[PDB]
């Protein structure tokens, strides 16, 4: 009867840490002094039980309590958010990432910073947005870039490397645009397997610009004094809970999210996981 929840590593929404030697999760406290809520999430490190926590885990716990359901959390096996591609060298198309697991039954609900878009909505159902954000660019402090329209992005060269995450909605955003064709062709040869790796690459001067979700990039840039964002969101998008079409949970999930937007719960999550301290990482 327990719902199979699938999520993905993506700070500050989902932190993933090893369990202690005894199998439990380290006791930690939030900026307010409250215990950090931790859930066991099984997934690749070899697949093993790990500790998960963060904005989305707090949201999951709230949803489960409000809707009275039990659950078990696991990390997406291929580590991706999800795009639709031909498989097995054939013309058969299947979704990968969390999208694929939801559609196959490996998961019953996606609880993560999952972008709501038209393409995905054709195959699954989304709750109303639990977070409003957009797309921006992360660069090393000192790198001068105007934004998505900067000549170094519009007129690609091996002197300034930029990229995004493979099999993500962001990669498709550029792929489905004839105007951004020159950009998509450039990133295609530099895209990273995960946001963490791309962010580290910018920090190590291996990647000059990382195009990604502002909710994630502004957090990263605000915690690391050596990283900054262009500041402007060149596109707006929301994060929502994902469920299969005609699921018995959609109505109640959106109802819970509405209440959380009305009573300060979502705002408190931001004060707990997003805006609470100066850079030092």
PDB file of C-alpha atoms in Angstrom:
ATOM      1  CA  UNK A   1       0.000   0.000   0.000  1.00  0.00           C
ATOM      2  CA  UNK A   2       3.081   2.204   0.395  1.00  0.00           C
ATOM      3  CA  UNK A   3       3.664   4.647  -2.457  1.00  0.00           C
ATOM      4  CA  UNK A   4       6.951   4.302  -4.315  1.00  0.00           C
ATOM      5  CA  UNK A   5       8.415   7.821  -4.248  1.00  0.00           C
ATOM      6  CA  UNK A   6      11.280   8.588  -6.603  1.00  0.00           C
ATOM      7  CA  UNK A   7      13.533  11.576  -6.134  1.00  0.00           C
ATOM      8  CA  UNK A   8      16.956  12.855  -7.163  1.00  0.00           C
ATOM      9  CA  UNK A   9      20.025  14.430  -5.551  1.00  0.00           C
ATOM     10  CA  UNK A  10      19.653  18.194  -5.945  1.00  0.00           C
ATOM     11  CA  UNK A  11      20.655  20.575  -3.156  1.00  0.00           C
ATOM     12  CA  UNK A  12      18.964  22.373  -1.457  1.00  0.00           C
ATOM     13  CA  UNK A  13      15.837  20.374  -2.351  1.00  0.00           C
ATOM     14  CA  UNK A  14      17.276  16.916  -1.742  1.00  0.00           C
ATOM     15  CA  UNK A  15      20.516  16.219   0.087  1.00  0.00           C
ATOM     16  CA  UNK A  16      21.865  12.665  -0.068  1.00  0.00           C
ATOM     17  CA  UNK A  17      24.327  11.439   2.554  1.00  0.00           C
ATOM     18  CA  UNK A  18      25.704   8.083   3.692  1.00  0.00           C
ATOM     19  CA  UNK A  19      24.143   6.456   6.744  1.00  0.00           C
ATOM     20  CA  UNK A  20      26.271   6.174   9.876  1.00  0.00           C
ATOM     21  CA  UNK A  21      28.078   2.897  10.478  1.00  0.00           C
ATOM     22  CA  UNK A  22      25.033   1.627  12.398  1.00  0.00           C
ATOM     23  CA  UNK A  23      22.606   2.313   9.563  1.00  0.00           C
ATOM     24  CA  UNK A  24      20.902   5.352  11.085  1.00  0.00           C
ATOM     25  CA  UNK A  25      21.073   8.992   9.994  1.00  0.00           C
ATOM     26  CA  UNK A  26      23.168  11.609  11.793  1.00  0.00           C
ATOM     27  CA  UNK A  27      21.164  13.803  14.160  1.00  0.00           C
ATOM     28  CA  UNK A  28      21.304  17.374  12.871  1.00  0.00           C
ATOM     29  CA  UNK A  29      19.378  20.593  13.429  1.00  0.00           C
ATOM     30  CA  UNK A  30      18.038  23.362  11.216  1.00  0.00           C
ATOM     31  CA  UNK A  31      18.883  27.046  11.486  1.00  0.00           C
ATOM     32  CA  UNK A  32      15.868  27.318  13.813  1.00  0.00           C
ATOM     33  CA  UNK A  33      17.106  24.570  16.122  1.00  0.00           C
ATOM     34  CA  UNK A  34      14.564  21.967  15.025  1.00  0.00           C
ATOM     35  CA  UNK A  35      15.635  18.422  14.181  1.00  0.00           C
ATOM     36  CA  UNK A  36      16.321  17.946  10.483  1.00  0.00           C
ATOM     37  CA  UNK A  37      13.784  15.401   9.235  1.00  0.00           C
ATOM     38  CA  UNK A  38      15.585  12.526   7.534  1.00  0.00           C
ATOM     39  CA  UNK A  39      14.225   9.654   5.486  1.00  0.00           C
ATOM     40  CA  UNK A  40      15.930   6.554   4.183  1.00  0.00           C
ATOM     41  CA  UNK A  41      16.344   6.649   0.410  1.00  0.00           C
ATOM     42  CA  UNK A  42      17.775   3.678  -1.444  1.00  0.00           C
ATOM     43  CA  UNK A  43      19.785   4.286  -4.583  1.00  0.00           C
ATOM     44  CA  UNK A  44      23.167   4.201  -6.349  1.00  0.00           C
ATOM     45  CA  UNK A  45      26.123   5.438  -4.286  1.00  0.00           C
ATOM     46  CA  UNK A  46      26.060  -0.232  -6.009  1.00  0.00           C
ATOM     47  CA  UNK A  47      22.585   0.555  -4.669  1.00  0.00           C
ATOM     48  CA  UNK A  48      22.396   1.069  -0.907  1.00  0.00           C
ATOM     49  CA  UNK A  49      20.277   2.804   1.761  1.00  0.00           C
ATOM     50  CA  UNK A  50      21.231   6.458   2.233  1.00  0.00           C
ATOM     51  CA  UNK A  51      19.942   9.483   4.156  1.00  0.00           C
ATOM     52  CA  UNK A  52      17.811  12.057   2.343  1.00  0.00           C
ATOM     53  CA  UNK A  53      16.625  15.457   3.591  1.00  0.00           C
ATOM     54  CA  UNK A  54      15.906  18.984   2.383  1.00  0.00           C
ATOM     55  CA  UNK A  55      13.114  21.165   0.995  1.00  0.00           C
ATOM     56  CA  UNK A  56      11.461  18.372  -0.999  1.00  0.00           C
ATOM     57  CA  UNK A  57      11.770  15.796   1.773  1.00  0.00           C
ATOM     58  CA  UNK A  58      10.039  18.181   4.196  1.00  0.00           C
ATOM     59  CA  UNK A  59       7.379  18.649   1.505  1.00  0.00           C
ATOM     60  CA  UNK A  60       6.999  14.873   1.079  1.00  0.00           C
ATOM     61  CA  UNK A  61       6.533  14.408   4.813  1.00  0.00           C
ATOM     62  CA  UNK A  62       3.861  17.134   4.832  1.00  0.00           C
ATOM     63  CA  UNK A  63       2.043  15.534   1.893  1.00  0.00           C
ATOM     64  CA  UNK A  64       2.122  12.056   3.425  1.00  0.00           C
ATOM     65  CA  UNK A  65       0.711  13.374   6.703  1.00  0.00           C
ATOM     66  CA  UNK A  66      -2.007  15.502   5.102  1.00  0.00           C
ATOM     67  CA  UNK A  67      -3.083  12.811   2.634  1.00  0.00           C
ATOM     68  CA  UNK A  68      -2.555   9.964   5.099  1.00  0.00           C
ATOM     69  CA  UNK A  69      -0.351   7.736   2.949  1.00  0.00           C
ATOM     70  CA  UNK A  70       2.749   5.664   3.664  1.00  0.00           C
ATOM     71  CA  UNK A  71       5.778   5.619   1.391  1.00  0.00           C
ATOM     72  CA  UNK A  72       9.261   4.386   0.529  1.00  0.00           C
ATOM     73  CA  UNK A  73      11.795   6.660  -1.162  1.00  0.00           C
ATOM     74  CA  UNK A  74      14.422   5.773  -3.741  1.00  0.00           C
ATOM     75  CA  UNK A  75      16.817   7.733  -5.945  1.00  0.00           C
ATOM     76  CA  UNK A  76      16.278   7.577  -9.703  1.00  0.00           C
ATOM     77  CA  UNK A  77      18.459   4.744 -11.014  1.00  0.00           C
ATOM     78  CA  UNK A  78      19.941   6.586 -13.997  1.00  0.00           C
ATOM     79  CA  UNK A  79      20.291   9.827 -12.038  1.00  0.00           C
ATOM     80  CA  UNK A  80      18.376  11.920 -14.585  1.00  0.00           C
ATOM     81  CA  UNK A  81      15.291  14.138 -14.493  1.00  0.00           C
ATOM     82  CA  UNK A  82      13.915  12.910 -17.798  1.00  0.00           C
ATOM     83  CA  UNK A  83      13.618  13.394 -21.549  1.00  0.00           C
ATOM     84  CA  UNK A  84      12.076  11.209 -24.260  1.00  0.00           C
ATOM     85  CA  UNK A  85      14.492   9.418 -26.599  1.00  0.00           C
ATOM     86  CA  UNK A  86      14.565   6.531 -29.046  1.00  0.00           C
ATOM     87  CA  UNK A  87      15.810   3.377 -27.322  1.00  0.00           C
ATOM     88  CA  UNK A  88      17.571   0.150 -28.270  1.00  0.00           C
ATOM     89  CA  UNK A  89      18.701   1.623 -31.594  1.00  0.00           C
ATOM     90  CA  UNK A  90      15.099   1.528 -32.803  1.00  0.00           C
ATOM     91  CA  UNK A  91      12.325   4.051 -33.424  1.00  0.00           C
ATOM     92  CA  UNK A  92      10.568   3.168 -30.165  1.00  0.00           C
ATOM     93  CA  UNK A  93      10.569   6.158 -27.812  1.00  0.00           C
ATOM     94  CA  UNK A  94      10.683   5.911 -24.031  1.00  0.00           C
ATOM     95  CA  UNK A  95      11.281   8.417 -21.256  1.00  0.00           C
ATOM     96  CA  UNK A  96      14.404   8.135 -19.116  1.00  0.00           C
ATOM     97  CA  UNK A  97      15.081   9.554 -15.654  1.00  0.00           C
ATOM     98  CA  UNK A  98      12.317  10.067 -13.110  1.00  0.00           C
ATOM     99  CA  UNK A  99       9.807  10.513 -15.932  1.00  0.00           C
ATOM    100  CA  UNK A 100      10.587   7.011 -17.161  1.00  0.00           C
ATOM    101  CA  UNK A 101      10.318   5.442 -13.714  1.00  0.00           C
ATOM    102  CA  UNK A 102       6.954   7.081 -13.084  1.00  0.00           C
ATOM    103  CA  UNK A 103       5.575   5.825 -16.406  1.00  0.00           C
ATOM    104  CA  UNK A 104       6.924   2.292 -15.914  1.00  0.00           C
ATOM    105  CA  UNK A 105       5.525   1.879 -12.413  1.00  0.00           C
ATOM    106  CA  UNK A 106       8.931   1.873 -10.714  1.00  0.00           C
ATOM    107  CA  UNK A 107       7.608   4.967  -8.961  1.00  0.00           C
ATOM    108  CA  UNK A 108       4.096   6.112  -8.075  1.00  0.00           C
ATOM    109  CA  UNK A 109       4.982   9.744  -7.438  1.00  0.00           C
ATOM    110  CA  UNK A 110       7.884  12.051  -8.282  1.00  0.00           C
ATOM    111  CA  UNK A 111       8.795  14.365  -5.398  1.00  0.00           C
ATOM    112  CA  UNK A 112      11.721  16.539  -6.421  1.00  0.00           C
ATOM    113  CA  UNK A 113      12.498  19.855  -8.117  1.00  0.00           C
ATOM    114  CA  UNK A 114      10.731  18.577 -11.245  1.00  0.00           C
ATOM    115  CA  UNK A 115      10.082  21.135 -13.983  1.00  0.00           C
ATOM    116  CA  UNK A 116       6.521  21.432 -15.268  1.00  0.00           C
ATOM    117  CA  UNK A 117       6.424  21.689 -19.066  1.00  0.00           C
ATOM    118  CA  UNK A 118       4.121  20.968 -22.007  1.00  0.00           C
ATOM    119  CA  UNK A 119       6.046  17.962 -23.321  1.00  0.00           C
ATOM    120  CA  UNK A 120       6.020  16.151 -19.975  1.00  0.00           C
ATOM    121  CA  UNK A 121       2.368  17.089 -19.385  1.00  0.00           C
ATOM    122  CA  UNK A 122       1.518  15.077 -22.509  1.00  0.00           C
ATOM    123  CA  UNK A 123       2.561  11.901 -20.692  1.00  0.00           C
ATOM    124  CA  UNK A 124       2.068  12.549 -16.980  1.00  0.00           C
ATOM    125  CA  UNK A 125       0.117  14.850 -14.677  1.00  0.00           C
ATOM    126  CA  UNK A 126       1.536  17.617 -12.493  1.00  0.00           C
ATOM    127  CA  UNK A 127       0.233  19.242  -9.343  1.00  0.00           C
ATOM    128  CA  UNK A 128       0.058  23.028  -9.317  1.00  0.00           C
ATOM    129  CA  UNK A 129       3.596  24.444  -8.779  1.00  0.00           C
ATOM    130  CA  UNK A 130       5.047  24.142  -5.285  1.00  0.00           C
ATOM    131  CA  UNK A 131       7.803  26.568  -6.295  1.00  0.00           C
ATOM    132  CA  UNK A 132       7.996  29.362  -8.869  1.00  0.00           C
ATOM    133  CA  UNK A 133      11.370  29.913 -10.514  1.00  0.00           C
ATOM    134  CA  UNK A 134      13.133  29.974 -13.862  1.00  0.00           C
ATOM    135  CA  UNK A 135      16.343  29.515 -15.798  1.00  0.00           C
ATOM    136  CA  UNK A 136      19.547  31.459 -15.215  1.00  0.00           C
ATOM    137  CA  UNK A 137      23.310  31.129 -15.656  1.00  0.00           C
ATOM    138  CA  UNK A 138      26.055  30.271 -13.160  1.00  0.00           C
ATOM    139  CA  UNK A 139      29.609  31.518 -13.701  1.00  0.00           C
ATOM    140  CA  UNK A 140      32.814  31.988 -11.697  1.00  0.00           C
ATOM    141  CA  UNK A 141      33.088  35.357  -9.930  1.00  0.00           C
ATOM    142  CA  UNK A 142      34.754  37.699 -12.409  1.00  0.00           C
ATOM    143  CA  UNK A 143      33.389  36.123 -15.581  1.00  0.00           C
ATOM    144  CA  UNK A 144      31.534  38.800 -17.545  1.00  0.00           C
ATOM    145  CA  UNK A 145      28.332  37.613 -19.227  1.00  0.00           C
ATOM    146  CA  UNK A 146      25.234  39.646 -20.106  1.00  0.00           C
ATOM    147  CA  UNK A 147      22.867  36.699 -20.102  1.00  0.00           C
ATOM    148  CA  UNK A 148      21.386  34.138 -22.478  1.00  0.00           C
ATOM    149  CA  UNK A 149      21.930  36.613 -25.332  1.00  0.00           C
ATOM    150  CA  UNK A 150      25.657  37.116 -24.716  1.00  0.00           C
ATOM    151  CA  UNK A 151      27.717  36.847 -27.949  1.00  0.00           C
ATOM    152  CA  UNK A 152      29.887  34.163 -26.336  1.00  0.00           C
ATOM    153  CA  UNK A 153      26.763  32.006 -26.119  1.00  0.00           C
ATOM    154  CA  UNK A 154      25.093  33.037 -29.382  1.00  0.00           C
ATOM    155  CA  UNK A 155      28.373  32.820 -31.329  1.00  0.00           C
ATOM    156  CA  UNK A 156      29.851  29.602 -29.768  1.00  0.00           C
ATOM    157  CA  UNK A 157      33.608  29.061 -29.552  1.00  0.00           C
ATOM    158  CA  UNK A 158      35.958  26.637 -27.791  1.00  0.00           C
ATOM    159  CA  UNK A 159      37.325  29.637 -25.883  1.00  0.00           C
ATOM    160  CA  UNK A 160      34.205  29.906 -23.716  1.00  0.00           C
ATOM    161  CA  UNK A 161      32.560  26.601 -22.793  1.00  0.00           C
ATOM    162  CA  UNK A 162      28.977  26.436 -21.537  1.00  0.00           C
ATOM    163  CA  UNK A 163      26.612  23.555 -20.869  1.00  0.00           C
ATOM    164  CA  UNK A 164      23.660  22.164 -18.940  1.00  0.00           C
ATOM    165  CA  UNK A 165      22.631  18.751 -17.593  1.00  0.00           C
ATOM    166  CA  UNK A 166      22.011  15.792 -19.901  1.00  0.00           C
ATOM    167  CA  UNK A 167      18.471  14.446 -20.225  1.00  0.00           C
ATOM    168  CA  UNK A 168      16.899  17.390 -18.404  1.00  0.00           C
ATOM    169  CA  UNK A 169      14.085  19.725 -19.427  1.00  0.00           C
ATOM    170  CA  UNK A 170      16.688  22.470 -19.783  1.00  0.00           C
ATOM    171  CA  UNK A 171      18.520  20.551 -22.501  1.00  0.00           C
ATOM    172  CA  UNK A 172      15.251  20.118 -24.397  1.00  0.00           C
ATOM    173  CA  UNK A 173      14.390  23.808 -23.984  1.00  0.00           C
ATOM    174  CA  UNK A 174      17.321  24.611 -26.265  1.00  0.00           C
ATOM    175  CA  UNK A 175      16.857  21.571 -28.495  1.00  0.00           C
ATOM    176  CA  UNK A 176      13.306  22.575 -29.423  1.00  0.00           C
ATOM    177  CA  UNK A 177      14.341  26.014 -30.697  1.00  0.00           C
ATOM    178  CA  UNK A 178      15.665  26.671 -34.208  1.00  0.00           C
ATOM    179  CA  UNK A 179      17.040  30.014 -33.030  1.00  0.00           C
ATOM    180  CA  UNK A 180      19.044  28.359 -30.246  1.00  0.00           C
ATOM    181  CA  UNK A 181      20.282  25.672 -32.650  1.00  0.00           C
ATOM    182  CA  UNK A 182      23.864  26.955 -32.602  1.00  0.00           C
ATOM    183  CA  UNK A 183      23.824  26.850 -28.794  1.00  0.00           C
ATOM    184  CA  UNK A 184      22.294  23.387 -28.511  1.00  0.00           C
ATOM    185  CA  UNK A 185      24.951  22.074 -30.895  1.00  0.00           C
ATOM    186  CA  UNK A 186      27.661  23.513 -28.647  1.00  0.00           C
ATOM    187  CA  UNK A 187      26.327  22.275 -25.308  1.00  0.00           C
ATOM    188  CA  UNK A 188      25.703  18.825 -26.788  1.00  0.00           C
ATOM    189  CA  UNK A 189      29.452  18.202 -26.627  1.00  0.00           C
ATOM    190  CA  UNK A 190      29.809  19.470 -23.060  1.00  0.00           C
ATOM    191  CA  UNK A 191      26.679  18.579 -21.074  1.00  0.00           C
ATOM    192  CA  UNK A 192      27.192  17.049 -17.626  1.00  0.00           C
ATOM    193  CA  UNK A 193      25.643  13.983 -15.990  1.00  0.00           C
ATOM    194  CA  UNK A 194      24.481  15.970 -12.947  1.00  0.00           C
ATOM    195  CA  UNK A 195      24.107  19.532 -11.672  1.00  0.00           C
ATOM    196  CA  UNK A 196      26.660  18.930  -8.909  1.00  0.00           C
ATOM    197  CA  UNK A 197      29.333  17.944 -11.419  1.00  0.00           C
ATOM    198  CA  UNK A 198      28.627  20.968 -13.621  1.00  0.00           C
ATOM    199  CA  UNK A 199      28.745  23.329 -10.650  1.00  0.00           C
ATOM    200  CA  UNK A 200      32.056  21.815  -9.539  1.00  0.00           C
ATOM    201  CA  UNK A 201      33.395  22.241 -13.080  1.00  0.00           C
ATOM    202  CA  UNK A 202      32.598  25.965 -13.017  1.00  0.00           C
ATOM    203  CA  UNK A 203      34.369  26.246  -9.677  1.00  0.00           C
ATOM    204  CA  UNK A 204      37.387  24.388 -11.105  1.00  0.00           C
ATOM    205  CA  UNK A 205      37.481  26.597 -14.210  1.00  0.00           C
ATOM    206  CA  UNK A 206      36.714  23.580 -16.412  1.00  0.00           C
ATOM    207  CA  UNK A 207      33.314  24.968 -17.417  1.00  0.00           C
ATOM    208  CA  UNK A 208      32.788  28.689 -18.028  1.00  0.00           C
ATOM    209  CA  UNK A 209      28.986  28.838 -17.786  1.00  0.00           C
ATOM    210  CA  UNK A 210      26.298  26.470 -16.478  1.00  0.00           C
ATOM    211  CA  UNK A 211      22.702  26.989 -17.616  1.00  0.00           C
ATOM    212  CA  UNK A 212      20.270  25.617 -15.035  1.00  0.00           C
ATOM    213  CA  UNK A 213      17.320  26.167 -12.653  1.00  0.00           C
ATOM    214  CA  UNK A 214      17.502  29.459 -10.776  1.00  0.00           C
ATOM    215  CA  UNK A 215      16.147  27.906  -7.566  1.00  0.00           C
ATOM    216  CA  UNK A 216      19.241  25.705  -7.507  1.00  0.00           C
ATOM    217  CA  UNK A 217      21.805  28.095  -8.998  1.00  0.00           C
ATOM    218  CA  UNK A 218      20.931  31.087  -6.821  1.00  0.00           C
ATOM    219  CA  UNK A 219      21.243  28.851  -3.763  1.00  0.00           C
ATOM    220  CA  UNK A 220      24.612  27.484  -4.906  1.00  0.00           C
ATOM    221  CA  UNK A 221      25.886  30.941  -5.801  1.00  0.00           C
ATOM    222  CA  UNK A 222      24.695  32.333  -2.454  1.00  0.00           C
ATOM    223  CA  UNK A 223      26.542  29.652  -0.483  1.00  0.00           C
ATOM    224  CA  UNK A 224      29.796  29.868  -2.446  1.00  0.00           C
ATOM    225  CA  UNK A 225      31.399  33.316  -2.596  1.00  0.00           C
ATOM    226  CA  UNK A 226      33.398  32.269  -5.684  1.00  0.00           C
ATOM    227  CA  UNK A 227      30.256  31.574  -7.743  1.00  0.00           C
ATOM    228  CA  UNK A 228      27.652  34.021  -9.047  1.00  0.00           C
ATOM    229  CA  UNK A 229      24.621  34.019 -11.350  1.00  0.00           C
ATOM    230  CA  UNK A 230      23.754  36.511 -14.082  1.00  0.00           C
ATOM    231  CA  UNK A 231      20.780  37.427 -11.911  1.00  0.00           C
ATOM    232  CA  UNK A 232      18.022  37.453 -14.519  1.00  0.00           C
ATOM    233  CA  UNK A 233      15.679  34.577 -15.312  1.00  0.00           C
ATOM    234  CA  UNK A 234      15.493  34.390 -19.100  1.00  0.00           C
ATOM    235  CA  UNK A 235      12.592  31.958 -18.788  1.00  0.00           C
ATOM    236  CA  UNK A 236      10.078  31.170 -16.048  1.00  0.00           C
ATOM    237  CA  UNK A 237       9.053  27.690 -14.938  1.00  0.00           C
ATOM    238  CA  UNK A 238       7.582  26.012 -11.899  1.00  0.00           C
ATOM    239  CA  UNK A 239       8.379  22.806 -10.031  1.00  0.00           C
ATOM    240  CA  UNK A 240       5.537  20.389  -9.438  1.00  0.00           C
ATOM    241  CA  UNK A 241       4.790  16.943  -8.052  1.00  0.00           C
ATOM    242  CA  UNK A 242       4.564  14.324 -10.800  1.00  0.00           C
ATOM    243  CA  UNK A 243       1.995  11.525 -11.018  1.00  0.00           C
ATOM    244  CA  UNK A 244       0.668   9.208 -13.722  1.00  0.00           C
ATOM    245  CA  UNK A 245      -2.351  10.368 -15.731  1.00  0.00           C
ATOM    246  CA  UNK A 246      -5.684   9.905 -13.938  1.00  0.00           C
ATOM    247  CA  UNK A 247      -3.999   9.316 -10.589  1.00  0.00           C
ATOM    248  CA  UNK A 248      -6.160   9.347  -7.439  1.00  0.00           C
ATOM    249  CA  UNK A 249      -3.679  11.733  -5.807  1.00  0.00           C
ATOM    250  CA  UNK A 250      -3.536  14.797  -8.085  1.00  0.00           C
ATOM    251  CA  UNK A 251      -6.523  16.646  -6.598  1.00  0.00           C
ATOM    252  CA  UNK A 252      -5.374  16.179  -3.012  1.00  0.00           C
ATOM    253  CA  UNK A 253      -1.726  16.938  -3.787  1.00  0.00           C
ATOM    254  CA  UNK A 254      -2.621  20.274  -5.359  1.00  0.00           C
ATOM    255  CA  UNK A 255      -4.973  20.968  -2.446  1.00  0.00           C
ATOM    256  CA  UNK A 256      -2.107  20.436  -0.012  1.00  0.00           C
ATOM    257  CA  UNK A 257       0.225  22.629  -2.062  1.00  0.00           C
ATOM    258  CA  UNK A 258      -2.414  25.369  -2.189  1.00  0.00           C
ATOM    259  CA  UNK A 259      -2.754  25.320   1.596  1.00  0.00           C
ATOM    260  CA  UNK A 260       1.039  25.434   1.974  1.00  0.00           C
ATOM    261  CA  UNK A 261       1.223  28.529  -0.249  1.00  0.00           C
ATOM    262  CA  UNK A 262      -1.554  30.130   1.828  1.00  0.00           C
ATOM    263  CA  UNK A 263      -0.384  29.470   5.386  1.00  0.00           C
ATOM    264  CA  UNK A 264       3.340  30.199   5.282  1.00  0.00           C
ATOM    265  CA  UNK A 265       4.551  26.592   5.151  1.00  0.00           C
ATOM    266  CA  UNK A 266       6.269  27.043   1.786  1.00  0.00           C
ATOM    267  CA  UNK A 267       7.725  30.360   2.914  1.00  0.00           C
ATOM    268  CA  UNK A 268       9.124  28.670   6.027  1.00  0.00           C
ATOM    269  CA  UNK A 269      10.746  26.002   3.868  1.00  0.00           C
ATOM    270  CA  UNK A 270      12.561  28.799   2.026  1.00  0.00           C
ATOM    271  CA  UNK A 271      13.768  30.309   5.300  1.00  0.00           C
ATOM    272  CA  UNK A 272      14.941  26.868   6.423  1.00  0.00           C
ATOM    273  CA  UNK A 273      16.577  25.557   3.244  1.00  0.00           C
ATOM    274  CA  UNK A 274      17.254  28.464   0.906  1.00  0.00           C
ATOM    275  CA  UNK A 275      17.810  31.886   2.483  1.00  0.00           C
ATOM    276  CA  UNK A 276      19.338  31.668   5.937  1.00  0.00           C
ATOM    277  CA  UNK A 277      23.090  32.385   5.969  1.00  0.00           C
ATOM    278  CA  UNK A 278      25.990  34.016   4.130  1.00  0.00           C
ATOM    279  CA  UNK A 279      28.427  32.261   1.769  1.00  0.00           C
ATOM    280  CA  UNK A 280      31.100  30.045   3.316  1.00  0.00           C
ATOM    281  CA  UNK A 281      31.187  26.873   1.205  1.00  0.00           C
TER     282      UNK A 281
END
